[PDB]
Design a protein around this nucleic acid. Structure first.
Lengths: 134, 49, 149, 62, 210, 49
RNA sequence: ACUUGAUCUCGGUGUUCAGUACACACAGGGACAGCAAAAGCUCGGCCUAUCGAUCCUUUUGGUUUAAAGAGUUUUUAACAA
RNA sequence: ACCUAUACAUUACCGCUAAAGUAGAUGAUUUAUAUUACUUGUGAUAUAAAUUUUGAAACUUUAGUGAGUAGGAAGGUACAAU
RNA sequence: AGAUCAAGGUUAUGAUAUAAAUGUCCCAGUGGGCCACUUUUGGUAAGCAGAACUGGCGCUGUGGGAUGAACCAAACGUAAU
RNA sequence: UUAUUAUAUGCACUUGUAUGAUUAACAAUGCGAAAGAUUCAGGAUACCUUCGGGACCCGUCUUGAAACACGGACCAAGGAGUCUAACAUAUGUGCAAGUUAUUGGGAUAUAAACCUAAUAGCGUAAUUAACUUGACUAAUAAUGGGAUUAGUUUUUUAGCUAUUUAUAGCUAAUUAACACAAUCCCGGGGCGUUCUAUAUAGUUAUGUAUAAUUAUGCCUCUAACUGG
RNA sequence: UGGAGCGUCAAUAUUCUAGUAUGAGAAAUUAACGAUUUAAGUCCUUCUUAAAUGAGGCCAUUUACCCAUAGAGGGUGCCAGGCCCGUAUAACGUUAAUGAUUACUAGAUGAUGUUUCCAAAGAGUCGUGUUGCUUGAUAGUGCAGCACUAAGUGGGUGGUAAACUCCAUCUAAAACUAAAUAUAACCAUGAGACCGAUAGUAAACAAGUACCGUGAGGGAAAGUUGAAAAGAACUCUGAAUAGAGAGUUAAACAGUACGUGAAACUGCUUAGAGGUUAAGCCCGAUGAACCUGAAUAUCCGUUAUGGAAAAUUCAUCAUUAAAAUUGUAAUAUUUAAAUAAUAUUAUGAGAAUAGUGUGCAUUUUUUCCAUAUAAGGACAUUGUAAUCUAUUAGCAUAUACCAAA
């Protein structure tokens, strides 16, 4: 059944993206909608429609393309694809995440979501710094 | 021993499972007496529960 | 064929005796290879735990055929899964169109015993034998038996 | 779970546990007449755990 | 052996890991047969796959007053009472076998209808092709009519369950049918002594004359 | 436990034809239990044959 | 003095100990009695010894079933002391 | 008066045994402020700000507690092929 | 002796419970032991044998009589005082 | 009378007392210096160098081995808890008075799987040596009754929070039901051995009375059934 | 599992059957097998720099260079569908194998019911006794040697012996038949939860050979230079195989133990050291020697204040373009209805992006520069100062108690 916890005990250890590395107790996965890499039961590949992804850029270094959840209008089994719609914030350094915190009204995932953004734009800032030292 | 390959059906095929495992209201057809099996937990939500 | 981390002796190496002792350890048979001597020195663990042994209860039944004692035994308490289950519902209206006919030889059941305690309906029933505690209670219940051909 | 988590007007029925026939192998020391406890048969008939110990004439009654 | 567990009854004395066949050719022993049977049934005709007639009923003892084994007998003395014609039926294919002497009149009848169940749909292919005396048909040739070659050859498939939801309903229910099973079965314990009651009765009055 | 509960799946041709008028139901086997104790196990102890 | 309880029968209980089996004692319930006027006493020596399990042989046994198609009759075969 | 023990006591720490707490986050929560109901003064509203994820096989917290061959179960790692 | 009403204090010695309560596997082992105090046979006797009631040694390191399985302190998670 | 104590401190503020295993202001010492690279602690990683205590050299039978008890020269590779057989128990997984294909064929790509029919295992219903007979008085009963009882229902009581003073929550009591599960006793019943009730009448049918296997009457010689 | 004949009952017959020539069929087809095809890049650039299959790519047709009824493999200077045979459907070809007809040869009329006449049947064997192996077989299973010696409505057989009454079912000692069953052989054939040269058959190879015992027979050891033999010319030295140079190769740190080269031994040089517990270690330091870990936006602030730059969904910004989300309303799939649930349909609010616009850089927005209170450190190792639970040492302010006076 298309049920959220049914997305979880079957993908508790049998995941094919979740590589644990003999040491850190059971963490790591590289799912495209992971965003904080353990498994909450929500930080993961599709939980049925509380999905979140923050993927940079794809066009370096301006944009921060972000999907959202493809909800009730869509089943969301495949769709005439409707699960993602990819809003992209741009044109700010330390303003636009407030637009991003305003973007959302299912408010549990939030603190981790921009926590990628406060370093991933830092991951794609550093060209007018780090430079010459002559 | 893992679930889920990406599976593609056809229309004459897809209208045989109702024969091959009947419905919640009936037994099936192409096997004698193979009823559609049971769940042990019939709502399986937790967040909306 | 085992999942052998579970199997007891893939953590036993290494203990330096492996599981069977360090004084009078695992010598290929101490016991007497088998059942010796049930009368002789294995006395105590053969009475108790196995009385009635060794001997002769007596009737030398020369070449039993297991057909003459076939008699598959059905009980009067079932009797109505024998008939259709919903067919009992129309017998409790009341309509006295019945006693019904219950063959047993066509079923695969032979002698009607009498655990039973049947309903109040009359039944015409056909068996290959009788049982006295049943047949009197059937006869109070308006139905009677008749021996099958 | 949607209806009565309190359990008001709720019945709780648990079946029998001497029910299974494989659970009468306990606990034998036959001298008592509180012995009563189903030895491990090979199979029924005659010359099966029925001469020496059980009945009268072959040594002793249990 | 240490405890209340199981008289060990196992027969591996004869150093019985000597001569054991391993059953590792189960399935190729299915795709020889199923390959040779369709070579043993491509050979004959649109004639079916077994296919003689197999008539016999009623398995022996009190284990079975019900079933009926599939037909190895065919009762020569039935045949003259059913329009045959033995060796003509043999090259028809009857499994005619000359050794069974079937004892019952309705069992005589049981194959008699089963004979006449066949022999009519049997299509009579001509020998001289003037087809004046065959004599059922030749226009029902199998290309025109049947050419079926279907396997199963039914043996009436053992019908009744049922249950017979039948009124009778009795009037003489004051008749204890159980006591028949107790009087007459005790009567079998007396048939020696009753004929010996018959010899002390029918011969006692002859001692009176002297 | 609803009999259909998701009863809209469309059928497409090779150009993926994103709507066609015949809309058959869902045959009530996608409500059946998805259970990884009997697919963990009865897979590999029947793989072995 | 007078009599056979050194009896038939059913199961429990005592000390041997694993709370086994044999054995021996002990209290009953039922019977049949035996002495004594009765109440009673008696299920062997005043109590602690004076003794044995299958297999069979063998009696005593109901007047007993089995011999597998059906008798009759003899034989063995079985249960119980 | 002193003397030394892996013993005794107290602070940390390890594992183990026991006890106990935590899941309506399309919320909860303060911090301010606009207002207000105004019930003096306590509350609801609105704005602004910030904190808020885990194999519930998780997590927090609490006490006690730890020798060991003969031997039994507990999770942990090597070397394999499928 | 049993069932069923009537009356009834605070439940009836101390001190605790590191938790109490039971049915299987008859579960792997083990069925050779040693010593001191008292109590003590056998022997003249012994670091010998033979025991009843404990504690200990085998299973046990340990601080102390230099030493020593038992003697007397104490029964052993890693650490500072 | 004489002593005494706490109660009669709101309003904001304060680096400020105490409280969440109640340790922390200050001062010194130093630039993560383009690359480069000094400073402070630590660090037997596995040596060597320098001293203080410790300390028998490893398996193993045995009460006891450092043994003046046996085996060990050194090293790399190889080596000893496996196979099936049926059972028992614990346990996982389906199913359920049912369960099982796995001997088989056919569907069809290959040692796979799929589909499948009668059986036939095992349970259902027991036995006594066997022939017999066959499991609670009833259209019902559950170790049939009893006490030990969780839980639910319920009697009313106060009671608390919400309180609309309803509606409920939680108390403890109390009333009743069912008494789950689980031990412990009492039953009754299938079966067998023991007497017994039978002094037996009865009973049903052969018989018997008649009509003609066939009809009805009854005595009941005959069977059979009934007594604890 | 039984007769023949007669009459009788019926059908009936230029006939059919089988054999071997025969050519079905203008050789038509089923195959058996070899056979025979290659289907399509060896494409343009890196690495190789010893070699490319790996590396980069290659219009569209929803991003294929190309093929696929061929993507299983093995040869190829490394991992390959298209480099090569192959493998894929299949064609080519030879042999049978399906005989329509023709001929010759061989035979045949029934079954059918009826009763007339004859229904003949296995001879040292059955079987009993009895001995001796042997059996599930027991007063007997069969198989045997010995003695016996059969009957004709009889002989066995019916799992307890013995007669005695019957019953049922079969007819002893004569003889043959393709099948479904067995296969460590021999012959051609594929297959995987097998071994990787102390494994696997005794042997991967000149293993039943070298070899010992006279004999019967016992039987080991030993596989793996690189892509190519390109196997090290010639010079020097010795009497030489050699050994230094010179080479050859990507490698000689791959040169007939010719890949990988350990472990025990140790030959060597540097480093230390020493008449000790005999060597060893273990505990904590120990110079020597290399090493490890070292850092960031305030006291009495994630403060005040001044400089620039870029810009603008943000202003007190307007519109417009959206798609959604949430929350209503409706419809369609429902187990009689609701509900739940998806699917489309619309409203609703606010947010939400893309685009334009007072001033749109006026007191905005976003990045850098500034002083001011302890102040550019904010960190590590350290000395204090006090606090806290344990804890020692060192003085004591006043009591109170008996007696002792």
């Amino acid at each position: 059944a298309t049920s959220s916890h049914l997305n979880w005990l079957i993908i508790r250890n049998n995941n094919a993206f979740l590589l644990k590395k003999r040491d850190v107790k059971k963490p790591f996965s590289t799912e495209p909608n992971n965003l904080a890499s353990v498994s909450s039961y929500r930080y993961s590949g599709i939980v049925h429609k509380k999905t979140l992804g923050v993927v940079p850029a794809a066009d370096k270094k301006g944009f921060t393309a972000v999907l959202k959840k493809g909800k009730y209008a869509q089943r969301p089994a495949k769709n005439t694809v409707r699960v993602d719609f990819k809003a992209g914030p741009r044109r700010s350094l330390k303003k636009l995440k407030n637009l991003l915190i305003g973007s959302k009204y299912r408010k549990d995932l939030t603190q981790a979501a921009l926590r990628r953004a406060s370093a991933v734009l830092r991951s794609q800032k550093p060209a007018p710094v780090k430079g010459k030292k002559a | 021993g893992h679930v889920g390959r990406f599976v593609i059906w056809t229309e004459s095929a897809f209208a045989r499972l109702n024969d091959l495992f009947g419905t919640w209201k009936k037994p099936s057809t192409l096997k004698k007496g193979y009823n559609l099996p049971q769940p042990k937990m019939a709502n399986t939500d937790l967040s909306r529960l | 064929m085992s999942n052998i981390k579970r199997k007891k002796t893939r953590k036993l190496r290494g203990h330096v005796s492996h599981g069977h002792g360090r004084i009078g350890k695992h010598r290929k048979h101490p016991g007497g290879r088998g059942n010796a001597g049930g009368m002789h020195h294995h006395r105590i663990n053969f009475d108790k735990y196995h009385p009635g042994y060794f001997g002769k209860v007596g009737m030398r039944n020369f070449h039993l055929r297991r057909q003459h004692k076939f008699r598959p035994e059905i009980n009067l308490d079932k009797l109505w899964s024998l008939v259709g289950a919903e067919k009992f519902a129309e017998l409790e209206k009341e309509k006295s169109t019945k006693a019904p006919v219950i063959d047993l030889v066509k079923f695969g059941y032979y002698k009607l015993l009498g655990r039973g305690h049947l309903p109040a309906r009359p039944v015409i029933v056909k068996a290959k034998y009788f049982s006295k505690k049943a047949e009197d209670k059937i006869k109070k219940a308006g139905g009677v038996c008749l021996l099958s051909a | 779970a949607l209806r009565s988590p309190t359990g008001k007007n709720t019945l709780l029925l648990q079946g029998r546990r001497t029910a299974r026939t494989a659970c009468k192998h306990f606990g034998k020391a036959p001298g008592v007449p509180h012995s009563h406890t189903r030895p491990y048969v090979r199979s029924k008939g005659r010359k099966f755990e029925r001469a020496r110990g059980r009945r009268s004439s072959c040594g002793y009654k249990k | 052996g240490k405890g209340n567990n199981m008289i060990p009854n196992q027969h591996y004395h004869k150093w019985w890991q000597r001569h054991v066949k391993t059953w590792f050719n189960q399935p190729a022993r299915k795709v020889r047969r199923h390959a040779n049977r369709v070579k043993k049934a491509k050979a004959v005709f649109p004639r079916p796959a077994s296919g003689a007639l197999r008539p016999v009923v009623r398995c022996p003892t009190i284990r079975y007053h019900t079933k009926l084994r599939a037909g190895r007998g065919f009762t020569l003395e039935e045949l003259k009472g059913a329009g045959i014609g033995a060796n003509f039926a043999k090259t028809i294919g009857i499994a005619v076998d000359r050794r069974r002497k079937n004892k019952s009149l309705e069992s005589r009848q049981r194959n008699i209808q089963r004979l006449k169940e066949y022999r009519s749909k049997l299509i009579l292919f001509p020998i001289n092709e003037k087809k004046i005396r065959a004599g059922e048909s030749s226009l029902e040739e199998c290309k025109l009519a049947t050419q079926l070659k279907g396997p199963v050859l039914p043996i009436k498939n053992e019908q009744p369950a049922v249950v017979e939801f039948r009124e009778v309903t009795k009037d003489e229910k004051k008749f204890k049918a159980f006591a028949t099973l107790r009087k007459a079965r005790t009567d079998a314990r007396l048939v020696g002594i009753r004929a010996k009651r018959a010899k002390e009765a029918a011969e006692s009055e002859d001692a009176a004359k002297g | 436990s609803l009999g259909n509960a998701r009863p809209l799946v469309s059928v497409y041709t090779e150009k993926n034809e994103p709507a066609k008028d015949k809309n058959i139901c869902l045959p009530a086997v996608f409500k059946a239990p998805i259970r990884p104790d009997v697919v963990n196990e009865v897979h590999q102890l029947l793989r072995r044959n």
